[PDB]
mmCIF file of C-alpha atoms in Angstrom:
data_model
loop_
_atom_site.group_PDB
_atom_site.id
_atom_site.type_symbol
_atom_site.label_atom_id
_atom_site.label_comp_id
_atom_site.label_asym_id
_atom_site.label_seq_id
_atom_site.Cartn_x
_atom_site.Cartn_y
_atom_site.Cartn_z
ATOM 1 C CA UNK A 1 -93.779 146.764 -233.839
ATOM 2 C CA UNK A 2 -96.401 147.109 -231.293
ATOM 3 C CA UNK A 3 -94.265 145.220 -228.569
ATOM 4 C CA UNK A 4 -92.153 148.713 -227.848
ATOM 5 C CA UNK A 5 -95.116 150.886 -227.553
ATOM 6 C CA UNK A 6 -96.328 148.834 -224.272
ATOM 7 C CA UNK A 7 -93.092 147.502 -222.730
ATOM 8 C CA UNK A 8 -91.033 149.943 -220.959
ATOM 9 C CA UNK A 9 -87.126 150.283 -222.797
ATOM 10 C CA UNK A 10 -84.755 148.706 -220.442
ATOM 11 C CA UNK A 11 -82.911 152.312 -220.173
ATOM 12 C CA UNK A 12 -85.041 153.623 -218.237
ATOM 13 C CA UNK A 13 -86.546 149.860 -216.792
ATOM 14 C CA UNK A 14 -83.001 149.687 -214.844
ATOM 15 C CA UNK A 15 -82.767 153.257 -213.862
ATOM 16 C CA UNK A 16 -86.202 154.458 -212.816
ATOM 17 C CA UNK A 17 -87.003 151.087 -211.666
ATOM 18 C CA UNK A 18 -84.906 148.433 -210.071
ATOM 19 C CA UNK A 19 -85.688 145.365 -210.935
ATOM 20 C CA UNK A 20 -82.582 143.406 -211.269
ATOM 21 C CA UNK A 21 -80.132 142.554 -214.109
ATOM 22 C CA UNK A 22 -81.377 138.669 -215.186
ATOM 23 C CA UNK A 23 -84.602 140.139 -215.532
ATOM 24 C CA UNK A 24 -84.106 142.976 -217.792
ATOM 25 C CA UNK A 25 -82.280 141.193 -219.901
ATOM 26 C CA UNK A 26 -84.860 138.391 -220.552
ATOM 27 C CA UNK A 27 -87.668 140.430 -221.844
ATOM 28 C CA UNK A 28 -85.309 142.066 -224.416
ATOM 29 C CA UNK A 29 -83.168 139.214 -225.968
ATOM 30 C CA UNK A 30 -85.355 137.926 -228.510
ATOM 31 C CA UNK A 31 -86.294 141.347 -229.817
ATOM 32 C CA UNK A 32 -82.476 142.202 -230.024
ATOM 33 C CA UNK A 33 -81.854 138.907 -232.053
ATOM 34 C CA UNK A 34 -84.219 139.631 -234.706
ATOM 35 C CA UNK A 35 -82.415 143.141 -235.624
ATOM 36 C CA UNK A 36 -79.426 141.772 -235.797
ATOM 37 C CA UNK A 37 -79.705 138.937 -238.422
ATOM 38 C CA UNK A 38 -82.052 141.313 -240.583
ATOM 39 C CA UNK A 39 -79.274 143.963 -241.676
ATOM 40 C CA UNK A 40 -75.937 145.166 -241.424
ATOM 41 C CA UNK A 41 -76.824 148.511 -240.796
ATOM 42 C CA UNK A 42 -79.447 147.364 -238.388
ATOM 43 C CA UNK A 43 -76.923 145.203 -236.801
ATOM 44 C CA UNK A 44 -75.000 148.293 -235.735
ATOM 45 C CA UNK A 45 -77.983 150.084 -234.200
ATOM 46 C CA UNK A 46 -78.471 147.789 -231.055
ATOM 47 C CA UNK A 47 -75.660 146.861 -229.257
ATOM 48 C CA UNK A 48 -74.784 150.265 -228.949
ATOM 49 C CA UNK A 49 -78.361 150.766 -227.218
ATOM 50 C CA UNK A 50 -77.281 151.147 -223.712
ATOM 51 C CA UNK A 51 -77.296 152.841 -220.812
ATOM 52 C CA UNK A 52 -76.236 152.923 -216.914
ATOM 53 C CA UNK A 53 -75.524 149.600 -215.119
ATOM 54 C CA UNK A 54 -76.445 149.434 -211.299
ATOM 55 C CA UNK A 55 -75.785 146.141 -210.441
ATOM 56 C CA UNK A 56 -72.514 145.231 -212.332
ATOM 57 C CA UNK A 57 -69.192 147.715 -212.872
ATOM 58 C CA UNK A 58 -67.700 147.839 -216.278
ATOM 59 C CA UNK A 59 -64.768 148.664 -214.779
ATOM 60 C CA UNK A 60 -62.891 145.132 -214.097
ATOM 61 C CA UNK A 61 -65.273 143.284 -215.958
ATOM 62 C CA UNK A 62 -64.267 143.444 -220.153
ATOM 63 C CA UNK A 63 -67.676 144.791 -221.421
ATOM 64 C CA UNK A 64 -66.779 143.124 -224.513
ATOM 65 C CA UNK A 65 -67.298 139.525 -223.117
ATOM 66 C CA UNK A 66 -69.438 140.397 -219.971
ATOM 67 C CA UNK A 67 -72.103 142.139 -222.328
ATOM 68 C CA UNK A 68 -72.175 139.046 -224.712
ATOM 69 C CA UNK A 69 -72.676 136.708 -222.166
ATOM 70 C CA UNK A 70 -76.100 137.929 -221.514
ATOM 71 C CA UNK A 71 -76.645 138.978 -225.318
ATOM 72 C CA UNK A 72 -76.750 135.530 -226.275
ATOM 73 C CA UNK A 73 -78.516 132.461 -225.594
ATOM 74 C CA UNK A 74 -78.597 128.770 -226.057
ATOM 75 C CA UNK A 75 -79.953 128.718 -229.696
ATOM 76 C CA UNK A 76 -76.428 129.410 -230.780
ATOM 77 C CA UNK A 77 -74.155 127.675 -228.765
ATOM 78 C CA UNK A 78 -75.034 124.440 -229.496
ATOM 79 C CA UNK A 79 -75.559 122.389 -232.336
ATOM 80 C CA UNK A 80 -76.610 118.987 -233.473
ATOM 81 C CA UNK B 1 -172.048 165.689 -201.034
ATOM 82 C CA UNK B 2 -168.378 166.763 -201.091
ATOM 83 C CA UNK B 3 -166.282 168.667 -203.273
ATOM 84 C CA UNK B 4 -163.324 166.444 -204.885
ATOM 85 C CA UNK B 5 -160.353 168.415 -205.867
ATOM 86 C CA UNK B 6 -158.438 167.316 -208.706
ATOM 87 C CA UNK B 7 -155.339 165.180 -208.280
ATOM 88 C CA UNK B 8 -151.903 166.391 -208.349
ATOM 89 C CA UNK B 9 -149.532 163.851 -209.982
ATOM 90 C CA UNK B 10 -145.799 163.361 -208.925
ATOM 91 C CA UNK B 11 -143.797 164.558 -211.902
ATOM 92 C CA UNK B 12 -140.336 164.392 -210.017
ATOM 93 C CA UNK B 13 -137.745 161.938 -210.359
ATOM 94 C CA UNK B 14 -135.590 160.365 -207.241
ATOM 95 C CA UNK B 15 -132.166 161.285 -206.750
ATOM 96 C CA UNK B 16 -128.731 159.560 -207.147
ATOM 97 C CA UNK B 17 -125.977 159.202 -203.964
ATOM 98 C CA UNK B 18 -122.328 159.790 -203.895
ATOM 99 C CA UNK B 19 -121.656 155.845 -204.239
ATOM 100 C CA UNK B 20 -121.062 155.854 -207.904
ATOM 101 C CA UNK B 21 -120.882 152.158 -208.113
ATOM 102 C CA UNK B 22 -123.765 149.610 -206.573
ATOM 103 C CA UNK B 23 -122.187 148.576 -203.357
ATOM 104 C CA UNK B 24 -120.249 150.247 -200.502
ATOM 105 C CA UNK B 25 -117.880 146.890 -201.477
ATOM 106 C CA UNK B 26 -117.423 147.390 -205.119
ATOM 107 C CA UNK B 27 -117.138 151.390 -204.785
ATOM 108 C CA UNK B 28 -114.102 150.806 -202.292
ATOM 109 C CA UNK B 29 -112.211 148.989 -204.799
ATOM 110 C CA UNK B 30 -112.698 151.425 -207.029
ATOM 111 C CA UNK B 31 -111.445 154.041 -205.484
ATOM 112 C CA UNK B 32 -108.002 153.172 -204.722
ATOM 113 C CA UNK B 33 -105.561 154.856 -207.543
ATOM 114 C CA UNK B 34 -103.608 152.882 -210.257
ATOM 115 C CA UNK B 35 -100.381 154.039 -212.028
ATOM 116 C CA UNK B 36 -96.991 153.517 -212.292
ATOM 117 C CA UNK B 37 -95.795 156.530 -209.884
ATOM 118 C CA UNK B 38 -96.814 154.740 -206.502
ATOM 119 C CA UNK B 39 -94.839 151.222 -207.604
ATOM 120 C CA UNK B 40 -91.546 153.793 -208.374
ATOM 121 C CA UNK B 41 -91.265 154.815 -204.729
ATOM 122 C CA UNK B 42 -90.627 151.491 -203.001
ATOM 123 C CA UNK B 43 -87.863 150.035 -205.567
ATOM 124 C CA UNK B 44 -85.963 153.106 -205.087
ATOM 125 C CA UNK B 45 -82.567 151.874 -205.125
ATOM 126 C CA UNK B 46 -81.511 147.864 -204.308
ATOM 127 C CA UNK B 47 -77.811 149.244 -203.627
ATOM 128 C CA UNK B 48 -79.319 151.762 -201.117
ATOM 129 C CA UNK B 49 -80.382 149.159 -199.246
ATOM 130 C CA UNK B 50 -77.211 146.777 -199.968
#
């Protein structure tokens, strides 16, 4: 719980700031993984946490797979 | 065959200077200012510039 306190949330990290979209994304993962294996009602609660994109348009892009390509990483893809 | 008068003692403490710090080196860096305001200015918009 103390990690959110000193971090700055990434809705306001890409819209006050700038820095750019493969960095956001890689401070945040981790803490949005272990949400949504605790509950069901937690697992709603994050990927609806959101907010303005600069550098990509949801417009041609299907949010649905463009979002979960960043939302997920290589501990789930493969197996052995 | 003189007349000693009797001695006056110093009872006063020396003054501080405006340098806050030790040196005129470490007091520089230490007055520069720190915050998240002056990094907000410069990353302004990457598109802007695109």
């Amino acid at each position: 719980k103390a990690f959110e306190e000193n971090v700055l949330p990434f809705v306001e990290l890409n819209n006050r700031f700038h820095l750019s979209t493969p960095w956001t994304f890689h401070i945040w993962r981790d803490y949005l993984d272990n949400q949504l294996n605790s509950n069901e009602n937690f697992s709603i609660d994050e990927l609806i946490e959101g907010a303005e994109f600069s550098d990509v348009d949801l417009t041609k892009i299907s949010k649905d797979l463009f979002t979960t390509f960043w939302r997920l990483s290589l501990y789930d893809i493969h197996f052995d | 065959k003189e007349k000693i008068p009797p001695p006056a003692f110093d009872e006063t403490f020396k003054k501080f200077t405006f340098i806050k710090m030790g040196n005129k080196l470490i007091n520089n860096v230490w007055k520069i200012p720190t915050g998240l305001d002056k990094i907000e200015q410069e990353v302004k918009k990457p598109e802007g510039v695109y």
